[PDB]
Design a protein around this nucleic acid. Structure first.
Ligand SMILES: [Mg+2]
Ligand SMILES: [Mg+2]
Ligand SMILES: [Mg+2]
Ligand SMILES: [Mg+2]
Ligand SMILES: [Mg+2]
Ligand SMILES: [Mg+2]
Ligand SMILES: [Mg+2]
Ligand SMILES: [Mg+2]
Ligand SMILES: [Mg+2]
Ligand SMILES: [Mg+2]
Ligand SMILES: [Mg+2]
Ligand SMILES: [Mg+2]
Ligand SMILES: [Mg+2]
Ligand SMILES: [Mg+2]
Ligand SMILES: [Mg+2]
Ligand SMILES: [Mg+2]
Ligand SMILES: [Mg+2]
Ligand SMILES: [Mg+2]
Ligand SMILES: [Mg+2]
Ligand SMILES: [Mg+2]
Ligand SMILES: [Mg+2]
Ligand SMILES: [Mg+2]
Ligand SMILES: [Mg+2]
Ligand SMILES: [Mg+2]
Ligand SMILES: [Mg+2]
Ligand SMILES: [Mg+2]
Ligand SMILES: [Mg+2]
Ligand SMILES: [Mg+2]
Ligand SMILES: [Mg+2]
Ligand SMILES: [Mg+2]
Ligand SMILES: [Mg+2]
Ligand SMILES: [Mg+2]
Ligand SMILES: [Mg+2]
Ligand SMILES: [Mg+2]
Ligand SMILES: [Mg+2]
Ligand SMILES: [Mg+2]
Ligand SMILES: [Mg+2]
Ligand SMILES: [Mg+2]
Ligand SMILES: [Mg+2]
Ligand SMILES: [Mg+2]
Ligand SMILES: [Mg+2]
Ligand SMILES: [Mg+2]
Ligand SMILES: [Mg+2]
Ligand SMILES: [Mg+2]
Ligand SMILES: [Mg+2]
Ligand SMILES: [Mg+2]
Ligand SMILES: [Mg+2]
Ligand SMILES: [Mg+2]
Ligand SMILES: [Mg+2]
Ligand SMILES: [Mg+2]
Ligand SMILES: [Mg+2]
Ligand SMILES: [Mg+2]
Ligand SMILES: [Mg+2]
Ligand SMILES: [Mg+2]
Ligand SMILES: [Mg+2]
Ligand SMILES: [Mg+2]
Ligand SMILES: [Mg+2]
Ligand SMILES: [Mg+2]
Ligand SMILES: [Mg+2]
Ligand SMILES: [Mg+2]
Ligand SMILES: [Mg+2]
Ligand SMILES: [Mg+2]
Ligand SMILES: [Mg+2]
Ligand SMILES: [Mg+2]
Lengths: 49, 236, 156, 250, 119, 64, 126
RNA sequence: AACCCGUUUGGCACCUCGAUGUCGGCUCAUCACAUCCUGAUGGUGGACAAUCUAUCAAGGGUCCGGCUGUUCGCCGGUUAAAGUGGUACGUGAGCUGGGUUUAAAACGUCGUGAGACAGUUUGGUCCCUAUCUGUUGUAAUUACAAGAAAAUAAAUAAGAAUUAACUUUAGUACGAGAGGACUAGGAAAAUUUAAUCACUGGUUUGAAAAUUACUUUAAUAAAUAAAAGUACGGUUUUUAAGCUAAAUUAAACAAGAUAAUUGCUGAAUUCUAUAUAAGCAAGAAUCUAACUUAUAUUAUUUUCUAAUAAACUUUUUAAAGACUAUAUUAU
RNA sequence: GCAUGAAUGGUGUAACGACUGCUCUGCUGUCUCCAAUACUUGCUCUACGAAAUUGAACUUUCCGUGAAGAUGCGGCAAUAUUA
RNA sequence: ACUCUUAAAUGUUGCAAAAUUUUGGGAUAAAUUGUAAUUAGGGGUGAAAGGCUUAUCAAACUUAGUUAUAGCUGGUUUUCCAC
RNA sequence: UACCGCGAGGGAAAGGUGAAAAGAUUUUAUAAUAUCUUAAAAGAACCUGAAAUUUAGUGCUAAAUACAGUUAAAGCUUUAUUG
């Protein structure tokens, strides 16, 4: 076991420090639901009062 | 330097008070008749204080017969010989000394039976302490003995004379190589970049032979250093 | 304690034990050295191979006890075989030039150097046998001279 | 500091205050340590003397940067970056003022293989009632089959002393400066000639707020400084602090 | 220093001569009772036909002592005998007369002024 | 005694690598930059024996 | 070391003795002694007692003290004084002793009960 | 009436019959919570106070003494309280042996008789040098990163004394009155614990004074004087230095998360409801963080290093100490 | 008088007791509360050198397990090695 | 002194197969003791306890019947093949 | 027989040189081993000389794991590798 667990590495950040390998892109975006409750997003000719 | 009993050290020796003070008086009456005893290391090192006081109160008696001192003299000595011995035979031999009358020196060997340390008291101007010192003198002068302090001074002095002529051959070779390499060859036909590595590396040779010439001379002062001198600190 | 040591070094290593058992041994190595002289060897080259031990005989008796009991006490003897080998002179210097000379070989060389009042020049020559620090140079100088050649190949 | 010994002095109101003496012997900074590089914000210091023939070579270069002499001990003190000091700065008894309460570290005295009674104040067994060879013994170490073993941190004999300890909440009574001493109203761990490592009290910043000057005592220019200094006695007399009349049984 | 089963010698003029302790006040556990501390008392010896008869369960303060009564300066005081004051309800001794001195280390202003003098 | 004074927790929860800040994978990378010009007397000649990044990595890449 | 501690204890003794309202006389055991010992400095009430000095301790140092025995309100009593203390206000000798006597007597508390007339009279031998 | 626990009285007869065990007491402990007090809270036929009941809660604490062989129990007195129990009804290779189960003897009763008793009474012997586990302490050898001399952090664990008169708020609120608070604070003392030895007290085979009997140094020249031994260190008394307690000094509040429990708005259940389902807030002597001490588990900084960094052996001494190790010291 | 009783002798009795039971004064480290000291023993080196015992042995905690109370089986774990 | 051994501690593979140390009983008498001798196995002797009788006593020691008996415990020696 | 027991009486241990003493010369702070005698030293409690026990020499060798072994894989090895 110990020989195996000697070969494991953990990080808190979104990176690893190794080089020559890839990194997961983080997902920071957050969906703007603005098109549902806002006329300023739409064009005025599509709308109606 | 013991905090317990007034700064002094104490040896129980498996003996209580009266059983110990009989040991003192016997050894001290023996330490004047024969003026040399071979014992263990602790019996030889338990008795130095009692004796160093024992002789003052004999030396005082010679100069000034004092009731206070002769009373000390009757207590620790049993016989009448030993009482009359040191006042006239010992105390006349010492000649106005107060400080230290007595030596204690240990031994490298141990007994055959018990394998115990050993050591001997001697009153300081004993005959055997003089005879033994004449032999060491005579053999070192004339016989089978090295006389190291000549061999040591010899070797640092052959060394000192040997470093200098390597220093002399350095200042020469620096100059001859410098004047050649700075004058004739800066005209061309060289790399002047390495010109720093010429002097910079050669001068280190001088510094080497010069830094070692400190060690040897310090190794000679220290061989000719009197007791009543200071300490000589050294570069590094 | 005495294994892979020079023979005269063993006695030095052995007088510091302060026992009967020590002295019983040194009477045996001093025998074996006497045989080697008799056999025309170079005692300056005489290392140790093995000191072998074994029981010989037991003499019983009685050690009494309380309440009529008794035990059996055995005084006993032993045997001491000793073996030595003189290294060839060539193998003795395969070691020194690496820096593993026996101290006893230097104690003699130091004691020789003083009896005849030697000079400074004789010491710089014989400094690779003469002290530990001087014998640490030789283990280091020697590591440098091989490496100069290792680099002479590594270029290619 | 180097402890020296003890005294005791009568205060204004007659009370005999025990006092413990400490001598700062050339306490001097050696190295500043910052969190960025060195991992922590702290100092170390150096006190005492050492002859030039017991000194080691790397100790020299460790000292010789900031141009300071050799020492006999070296210890750290966590501090804040606001309250750093320079290197080579020498510290004085003026760093403390009498009235504030002080912490101490140090090593205790040494008794040896202390017996069982001496080490935990066990009770004896009853001598002279048919007792057979267990007068000072501990007695039972444990129970039978369950648990079936002796537990840990259990009370037994052993080396008592030479233990690193602290003693909180100790006053500073007075100061001398020309003879760089400090006097403390109480006891400290260790026979004299023993190091002692003192600091302000974590346990109370309230009481000592008056008596506290950061980072340490600057002298101030063109002013007359006192070489010796005490604190103010209590406002009340111990001989006059009486018991209340109704503090009575029935 | 006072313990259970100490014989005492009161000074209040109630006819009592010698007297014993069997309880100590001031906490759950007391193994000792120093000055200005209370005790209970049985009576053992009296003037005859006394209105304080034998075997009466009383309270008391103890006043003096034979041990070193410390003072703050380092000095200390020491008597030849222990002395007590037998009590009704509170600090209200039986005999109106007190008959003797006191140590100042008991610290009760009204209770001291009743006496001759205190060291 | 060590044998008897121990604590029988698992190593995994005693382990020093794990901290409040993070896991201590190997070590810190250290920039061994040395001023090879402002040297002392007895180390001037042997300046070539000192580590220098811009030279050594040139050599590995040269030999490699 | 400790010697540094003593030289502070000596200067401070001198600072007091040269400042006290009175001076120290040369008295011995066997000599009578008065003194006004206080109870508090806020209120200078005290007591004056005549008594027979049984011992002296640490004379000519900072913890100097002595012992007396006297009879206060008809009650024999013992007290141990710190000589250089502030609570003393007076110190006086009434009757002198005479002759060879021991430095520390102690047989007036232990091994004996005393009267007035033995305490107001010094040791006198011819 | 439905389940639980395994502390009592018992049923069975699975382990041990090829050296041992019974109750109680001294010393020493550890665990549970189904909590005696302290701490928090709901309810009340709860005005205040005192008290009753239930829940959450194991941090620390939980008496001396008389009679008895005695746990128990009665009694005297007290306290914040004098908890219920388990651990081969904890603890006999750690102590005792009083009770009870051997031999002697006596009374009573039964028995022709030897003798017997879930009756009494006086007396009354088992031992041990600790191989391993376990534990309190102490070191050695070795490993890690180039090698070495020093200083620290980080991480985990262990540890931490409880109570409160009296007093201020306040004789206020409450109350016909008697009486008498919540809240927020200060705080003597007792018990326990740690560090220390300037003072005090004890100790003193270390130092000294006085002194009795016999003997002796050494004395059939005397006299004076000194000195030694033996008699518990001869006895009594004083005392340096150290150790020591009877002595000295002193032993935090707050903050964060939560347990029973308190609350804001507001639906399901068309509500001036509901502390919850989205969501926003409180709540303890506990737990955490912090503080203290220790540690071959990982890591950092400083400085030096072979034409010379280091360490080990030996001596002296100790304030350190079984040995060692640490400290100190010599060349 | 559960189940006393007259030569298995009944009742009482000054003196004597290394006899059994209770009480008092004095005394005191038995105890509150234990401390310091001397020698011996002990620990270190050295010479000599026993005893009962012992399947083998590289000999760990807890719960569970089970010929019914586990160092040795099971299950999560502990220990650089030894004195 | 001598003789006996009440009480405690020590010791328990001890100095000792019943002692050491301290204490204690009797001490002109029913006393203590030396030398040599008698009494002998269901008998001896016994100020009686089932004690003593060469460290052995609800019936000695030695030899012999005798290789006592045992429905009891403990043990029963090399290999392969079948039921 | 020795030893034990006051006594009757009980009651062990213990073999081997070589054909022939030719029983070991000489060197050596002192050869078990060269040399000499002899077929060989089989070297004096001396034929052969097992096992338990035990020492040394050369190999691989640890740092967690255990009725102390088995089956399998990988690694290093004395010309002893047959570990
Ligand atoms: Mg001894
Ligand atoms: Mg004597
Ligand atoms: Mg044997
Ligand atoms: Mg010590
Ligand atoms: Mg105590
Ligand atoms: Mg007790
Ligand atoms: Mg016994
Ligand atoms: Mg005893
Ligand atoms: Mg179990
Ligand atoms: Mg267990
Ligand atoms: Mg004086
Ligand atoms: Mg006194
Ligand atoms: Mg059965
Ligand atoms: Mg069973
Ligand atoms: Mg059977
Ligand atoms: Mg069995
Ligand atoms: Mg609960
Ligand atoms: Mg509890
Ligand atoms: Mg807590
Ligand atoms: Mg009674
Ligand atoms: Mg009783
Ligand atoms: Mg009650
Ligand atoms: Mg049992
Ligand atoms: Mg039990
Ligand atoms: Mg047991
Ligand atoms: Mg009948
Ligand atoms: Mg009796
Ligand atoms: Mg062991
Ligand atoms: Mg075991
Ligand atoms: Mg303490
Ligand atoms: Mg003291
Ligand atoms: Mg004293
Ligand atoms: Mg004395
Ligand atoms: Mg005399
Ligand atoms: Mg005599
Ligand atoms: Mg003292
Ligand atoms: Mg909160
Ligand atoms: Mg609603
Ligand atoms: Mg609502
Ligand atoms: Mg009848
Ligand atoms: Mg009858
Ligand atoms: Mg009739
Ligand atoms: Mg009869
Ligand atoms: Mg009759
Ligand atoms: Mg009658
Ligand atoms: Mg009668
Ligand atoms: Mg009798
Ligand atoms: Mg009766
Ligand atoms: Mg105590
Ligand atoms: Mg193991
Ligand atoms: Mg189990
Ligand atoms: Mg299985
Ligand atoms: Mg298992
Ligand atoms: Mg007698
Ligand atoms: Mg009598
Ligand atoms: Mg009589
Ligand atoms: Mg009978
Ligand atoms: Mg018999
Ligand atoms: Mg028969
Ligand atoms: Mg037949
Ligand atoms: Mg039959
Ligand atoms: Mg031939
Ligand atoms: Mg031949
Ligand atoms: Mg043979």
């Amino acid at each position: 076991r110990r020989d195996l667990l000697k070969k494991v590495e953990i990080y808190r950040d979104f990176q690893h420090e190794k080089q020559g390998l890839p990194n997961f892109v983080p997902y920071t975006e957050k969906e703007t639901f603005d098109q549902y409750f806002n006329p300023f997003v739409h064009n005025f000719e599509d709308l109606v009062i | 330097g013991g905090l317990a009993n007034n700064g002094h050290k104490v040896y129980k020796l498996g003996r209580a008070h009266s059983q110990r003070f009989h040991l003192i008086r016997t050894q001290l009456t023996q330490l004047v008749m024969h003026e040399r005893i071979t014992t263990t290391k602790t019996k030889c090192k338990h008795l130095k204080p009692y004796a160093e006081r024992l002789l003052l109160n004999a030396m005082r008696v010679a100069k000034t017969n004092s009731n206070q001192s002769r009373s000390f003299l009757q207590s620790f000595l049993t016989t009448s010989l030993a009482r009359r011995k040191i006042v006239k035979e010992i105390a006349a031999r010492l000649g106005d000394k107060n400080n230290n009358f007595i030596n204690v020196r240990f031994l490298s060997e141990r007994r055959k039976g018990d394998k115990a340390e050993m050591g001997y008291i001697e009153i300081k101007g004993n005959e055997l302490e003089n005879y033994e010192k004449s032999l060491e003198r005579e053999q070192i002068e004339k016989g089978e003995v090295p006389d190291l302090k000549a061999f040591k001074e010899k070797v640092f002095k052959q060394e000192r004379d040997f470093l200098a002529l390597k220093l002399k051959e350095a200042e020469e070779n620096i100059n001859l190589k410098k004047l050649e390499d700075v004058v004739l060859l800066e005209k061309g036909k060289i790399d002047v970049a390495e010109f720093n590595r010429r002097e910079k590396a050669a001068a280190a040779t001088k510094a080497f032979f010069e830094s070692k010439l400190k060690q040897v001379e310090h190794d000679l002062f220290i061989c000719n250093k009197n007791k009543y001198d200071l300490i000589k600190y050294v570069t590094y | 304690a005495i294994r892979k040591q020079h023979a005269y070094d063993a006695l030095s290593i052995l007088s510091n034990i302060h026992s009967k058992a020590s002295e019983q041994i040194a009477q045996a190595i001093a025998k074996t050295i006497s045989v080697a002289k008799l056999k025309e060897m170079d005692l300056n080259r005489l290392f140790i191979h093995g000191v072998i031990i074994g029981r010989k005989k037991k003499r019983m008796g009685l050690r009494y006890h309380a309440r009529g009991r008794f035990g059996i006490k055995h005084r006993q003897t032993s045997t001491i075989k000793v073996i030595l080998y003189e290294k060839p002179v060539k193998q003795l210097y395969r070691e020194m030039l690496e820096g593993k000379t026996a101290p006893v070989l230097a104690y003699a060389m130091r004691q020789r150097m003083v009896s005849e009042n030697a000079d400074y020049d004789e010491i710089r020559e014989n400094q690779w046998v003469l002290t530990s620090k001087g014998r640490q140079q030789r283990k280091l100088m020697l590591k440098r001279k091989v490496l100069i050649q290792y680099l002479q190949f590594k270029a290619k | 500091g180097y402890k020296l010994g003890m005294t005791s002095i009568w205060d204004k109101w007659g009370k005999l205050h025990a006092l413990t003496v400490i001598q700062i012997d050339r306490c001097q900074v050696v190295q500043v340590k910052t969190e960025e590089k060195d991992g922590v914000n702290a100092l170390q210091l150096g006190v005492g003397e050492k002859s030039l023939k017991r000194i080691n070579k790397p100790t020299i270069g460790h000292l010789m940067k900031n141009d300071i002499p050799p020492k006999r001990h070296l210890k750290e003190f966590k501090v804040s970056p606001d309250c750093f000091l320079p290197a080579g700065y020498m510290l004085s008894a003026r760093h403390f003022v009498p009235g504030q309460y002080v912490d101490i570290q140090g090593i205790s005295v040494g008794k040896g293989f202390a017996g069982t009674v001496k080490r935990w104040n066990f009770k004896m067994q009853d001598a002279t009632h048919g007792n057979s060879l267990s007068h000072r013994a501990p007695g039972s170490t444990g129970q039978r089959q369950d648990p079936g073993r002796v537990f840990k941190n259990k009370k037994m004999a052993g080396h008592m002393g030479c233990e690193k300890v602290t003693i909180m909440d100790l006053q500073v009574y007075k100061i001398d400066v020309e003879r760089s001493l400090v006097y403390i109203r109480g006891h400290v761990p260790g026979k004299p000639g023993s190091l002692v490592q003192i600091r302000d009290a974590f346990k109370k910043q309230v009481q000592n707020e008056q008596f506290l000057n950061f980072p340490t005592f600057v002298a101030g220019k063109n002013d007359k400084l006192a070489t010796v200094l005490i604190m103010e006695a209590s406002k009340s007399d111990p001989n006059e602090e009486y018991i209340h009349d109704n503090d009575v049984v029935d | 220093m006072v313990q259970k089963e100490t014989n005492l010698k009161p000074i209040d003029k109630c006819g009592v001569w010698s007297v014993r302790v069997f309880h100590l006040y001031g906490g759950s556990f007391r193994k000792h009772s120093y000055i200005s501390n209370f005790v209970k008392i049985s009576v053992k010896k009296t003037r005859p036909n006394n209105w304080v008869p034998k075997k009466t369960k009383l309270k008391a303060i103890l006043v003096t002592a034979k041990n070193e009564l410390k003072k703050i300066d380092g000095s200390y005081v020491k008597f030849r005998s222990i002395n007590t004051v037998l009590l009704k309800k509170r600090l209200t001794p039986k005999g109106k007369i007190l008959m003797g001195p006191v140590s100042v280390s008991l610290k009760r202003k009204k209770f001291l002024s009743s006496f001759c003098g205190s060291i | 005694s060590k044998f008897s004074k121990r604590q029988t927790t698992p190593k995994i929860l005693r382990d020093h690598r794990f901290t409040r800040k993070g896991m201590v994978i190997r070590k810190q990378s250290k920039n061994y930059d040395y001023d090879l010009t402002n040297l002392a007397a007895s180390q001037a000649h042997q300046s070539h024996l000192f580590f220098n990044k811009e030279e050594d990595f040139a050599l590995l890449k040269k030999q490699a | 070391g400790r010697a540094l501690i003593k030289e502070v204890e000596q200067r401070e003794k001198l600072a007091i003795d040269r400042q006290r309202e009175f001076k120290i006389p040369d008295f011995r055991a066997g000599d009578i002694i008065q003194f006004h010992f206080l109870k508090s400095i806020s209120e200078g009430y005290g007591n004056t007692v005549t008594g027979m000095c049984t011992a002296r301790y640490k004379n000519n140092s900072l913890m100097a003290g002595f012992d007396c025995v006297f009879r206060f309100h008809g009650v024999e009593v013992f007290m141990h004084v710190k000589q250089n203390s502030p609570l003393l206000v007076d110190l006086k000798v009434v009757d002198k002793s005479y002759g060879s006597i021991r430095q520390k007597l102690n047989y007036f508390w232990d091994d004996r009960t005393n009267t007035e007339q033995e305490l107001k009279k010094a040791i006198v031998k011819g």
